[PDB]
Design a protein around this ligand. Structure first.
Ligand code: CS
Ligand code: CS
Ligand code: CS
Ligand code: CS
Ligand code: CS
Ligand code: CS
Lengths: 249, 221, 245, 235, 241, 247
């Protein structure tokens, strides 16, 4: 339960694996996994993969790609067409399962080709598990607090402090995702973020946009009312609203 | 004042469409004062598209002036143009309204039904003026529903309860626009700042009335 | 039946011949004072307005002028509410011990000028003092009060009623001249900033300010000024109740 | 005593026999105009309204309609305050030369109709001991209901002492206040500081102003101001 | 001059031979515990962490965990501060008599474990502040902390819960729980610096004035929560924190 | 490549043997001072932080402590920027004459330290080069990402993430800088900073102070309205205003 033996667990596991492929998201957990992998195995035996997809922002992709380079890993992007699976295109409740399946199926193809012994992700002990992958922080009982601590011990400083999550969550179940509406939602959230709100949602309800913000920031939002209204109207919405129960999940 | 009083003497017996406003109160009192309690019949309309406070306040308000008051109820929702909320709904409603007042007038015996310049009106008001006004004007609840939407007994009650709640918080000028699972709240932009302490309570309150998401329009009115 | 009620009221006044009216400034006592004046004449009506440590000087001056404007001969009287321990110690029965002291003074006043009874504005919604509510004996229903006032031209009364300052103190807490002055000064300040509906609840070294919730947002710009002022008025801590009014 | 002062006003008016009233549209000028009418009769009282380059056209018209509705024969007059250099150059006594020019014209009109009065609290109200609270009482007692709940001061107050007033800056200032008024702020001043607009609001209203920040910034910038600011001490 | 400062610390430690440390979890106690461990070894160092009713269980656990991570022999003990009448009735002397109970227990621990002194972290009970004797400034502590690799201390300061009560009000287990439950709630809304001041039936909240604007959306929710926790009135102090 | 960029830099430091560092507190000067310390040792590196009337005391003290904590012998020095007529007269040239005066002092310090060069923290993208000082990161092709790359590798985790311009930006170009108005502007911003607004400008318009804040922070300012008004009025301003178009 000491942070040191947690680290020791992580190091011996990697030494056993010898060659790894890292599912690199750009967050703190992914950064700790990629950083520790390089520190134990060296740049030649680690491959960082970043997924380019229509369900996450281009900025998240671009900074993650550079973040891996700053960590000293040979990084490789790969593009995933999530909308090619009908459960995702039609935004059923099982969408998450087919997305992760399509994602881990792609990473195992990559690892199988560069000879790697495992795919690595940044699951930590916090209902999620994925058999064809090794979550070494979860496996060594790394808690959110242990990740921040080991990250500071190593000097890792520059990750992406906000998770942002898949855009399918901005559409109701049963709604079909298209390039236009996804682009419509992404343009809206990019705007609200540029005003200073890193945690933001623009939920799609056809002609109504419903914005979720953290309740503690709603007071500060008032100065942007008219600008958000006119801008989100340029993107296709007729009504621009603010959900009074703020940012739920 | 000279012309209006002479016009009243000519009609002798009248029925007044009483709204509670500046015009309706002044005409009803002058009609009562010129034609007498025995010759004036005041009617105030009760309907599913306006709140009971407008109705109940109007019946008690006119009695205070000393006129005999008569309520009548109108099933606007029996007209398909209103039930289906076409843009022409206003016209069929007013048509349905005056045909009811003309039936009433014919049976009571009135010569006419009276309705409600403003600068000349404000002056004649000063001669007496009275209190227990109805200083706020009403609007039909049809405006809270889009044109394609069919009006039901439940959603009208739903929207009216929501506005009645928001009014009680201290926001007399408000609209709760109906979009099925979404409530869209219109407030005057100068009041949106003052609304913030009530956010969570309005959310849980309007949700218990049937709404799934409770929202506030960034453009106010 | 409105005329029927007014006639009853008139028959009561004419019969009594001389009256003293506890004039509050409100619509009801104003209507009573107007009808009393109209039925018996200025010389046979004495309107009394009570001055006490439990209400503001502004409130007293306002009632005194409202009686003067109707054309009534008006007389102020000062009451030492704090001499009775039931008020001084602010028990929950304080409301009645205050009203008992009030009607007894009205009977002393009435007894010396010659009035047949004391008049107040109680309404069909005191007995121990021979006080009569002519509006309530004739089933005036608040709607009739607004009605007879319009008939008579009564247009200008005291639109907001005055609560006693004892409501600013918790039960059992003893009132001193300074506590009352502290509280009233605090509310006079807060009203002057633009908050006509306000309370400064007294909790010894704590001030607890009650506002209409919709006005708290506007209140923020005055926190430090209000804090320093109510602190200079005797409070050590100045707080704002999260549950408003 | 509220009637003892009414008697003073009525006694003074009968003595004057014929009157000319400087009617501003406010509570005080309204009370005088009504009393002159009822004590002296419509034929012996003339209400004069001053129009000038220093007050709003809306302010003039609201006064004109109220005087007629009170039943007075009312007469408009225009004053070119900008022709006196003390007014145009806004030195500190500019108020005195404007008021002098105003009463000199009001004395002119009155002599020609034949009258032998203003709303200060000659000011027949400030003689009978009216202290603003007495004025509202006589206003309620008399049935007066409609006047200007917001007091209109001359726009020369928006410029620092020494600034010369032009039609352009005056219009600029009046356009800005007219804009801010339409947003829900009836009490407002836009102080002119060349390229800087300094906006005074009642402190109780500053909280509500935030939703309009960017709109007024771009609007007052379009009227000629470069920087649009809000005075922290407000009105 | 910094390298001579470390030397004073090393000599003072070597002279003592066996030590017990009052470990707070902060940077100073971390530096003292780490250097004692580095000079004397785990077998000659005892880290003491106190559990008491005036500080949180969360804070207790974090000091316990920080001490284990440095590799120290750690000894928790509980202190019943409310058995001293100065603390229970919260006179103004409470702070000093509380510290006396604390240093008496640690010196009792030190006498039985075998240590020469009780060490604490400060830049009449035999306690010794070695960073002080050697003249460490806050600037010098952060410097030696990085020289050693320390990154993980307790960045949050901790006041005793006696500060939430006025002098003369007596502290009980129940009102203390009430005050701490309230502050933890407010912290969970997002206000890390907060006090819930106890005035019997009145709750008085001190906040950073810059966050009072942001607080309004929680007004009614805080009212009902702290009312449910025992308060009758929930108030906000206008002069902030 | 980065392994061999560190290499060029470490080789360059060994050649100079003794150095003086222009320490700003930012990541770039932090990387250089840290590498000089790691390659040449504490005895051979002298960190200099400049105090002046055009920058805050907070920025000065924060840089001094960052160098102390990094393990460098740190030495403050003060510059009288207002003695140069180009700086006092707030022309568009002022920045250059300031940097000339600044590097001129670093060279005197260096001559007394015994150092072979003056090092600054400039990276690949006249005052610096007229004085002969050297940007060692520029010389190994360090780009912003290579600075961040190496900062993690050395453990550098604590630098000064906020940049800070000279006070002359609070004055229009025609205005000549005086000690009294500089004190006026700086006291005000230090005041506003203490209220909880780290990003602030007090623009000087003679009798008018015009305050720039982030729009997202204007809402929070309300409880401080009357105190900021009276405080800046006590500092010499007649009117204290807030720009509606923020920062
Ligand atoms: Cs797994
Ligand atoms: Cs109804
Ligand atoms: Cs009094
Ligand atoms: Cs004009
Ligand atoms: Cs505990
Ligand atoms: Cs300085």
């Amino acid at each position: 339960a000491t942070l040191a033996t947690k680290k020791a667990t992580l190091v011996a596991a990697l030494k056993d694996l010898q060659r790894v492929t890292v599912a690199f998201s750009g967050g703190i957990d992914s950064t700790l996994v990629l950083k520790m992998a390089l520190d134990v195995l060296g740049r030649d035996n680690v491959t960082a993969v970043v997924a380019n997809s229509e369900l996450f922002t281009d900025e998240e992709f671009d900074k993650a790609m550079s973040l891996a380079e700053e960590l000293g890993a040979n990084v490789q992007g790969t593009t995933l067409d999530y909308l090619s699976d009908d459960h995702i295109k039609n935004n059923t409740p099982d969408s998450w399962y087919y997305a992760k399946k399509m994602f881990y199926s792609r990473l195992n193809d990559i690892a199988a080709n560069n000879g790697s012994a495992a795919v690595l992700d940044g699951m930590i002990k916090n209902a999620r598990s994925e058999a064809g992958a090794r979550s070494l922080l979860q496996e060594a009982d790394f808690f959110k607090t242990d990740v921040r601590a080991l990250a500071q011990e190593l000097g890792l400083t520059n990750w992406n402090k906000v998770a942002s999550c898949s855009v399918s969550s901005r559409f109701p179940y049963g709604t079909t995702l298209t390039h236009d509406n996804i682009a419509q939602v992404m343009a809206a959230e990019k705007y609200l973020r540029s005003l200073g709100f890193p945690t933001v949602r623009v939920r799609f309800h056809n002609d109504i946009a419903r914005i979720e913000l953290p309740e503690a920031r709603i007071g500060d939002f008032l100065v942007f009312n008219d600008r958000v209204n006119r801008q989100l109207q340029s993107l296709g919405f007729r009504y621009v609203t603010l959900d009074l129960g703020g940012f739920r999940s």
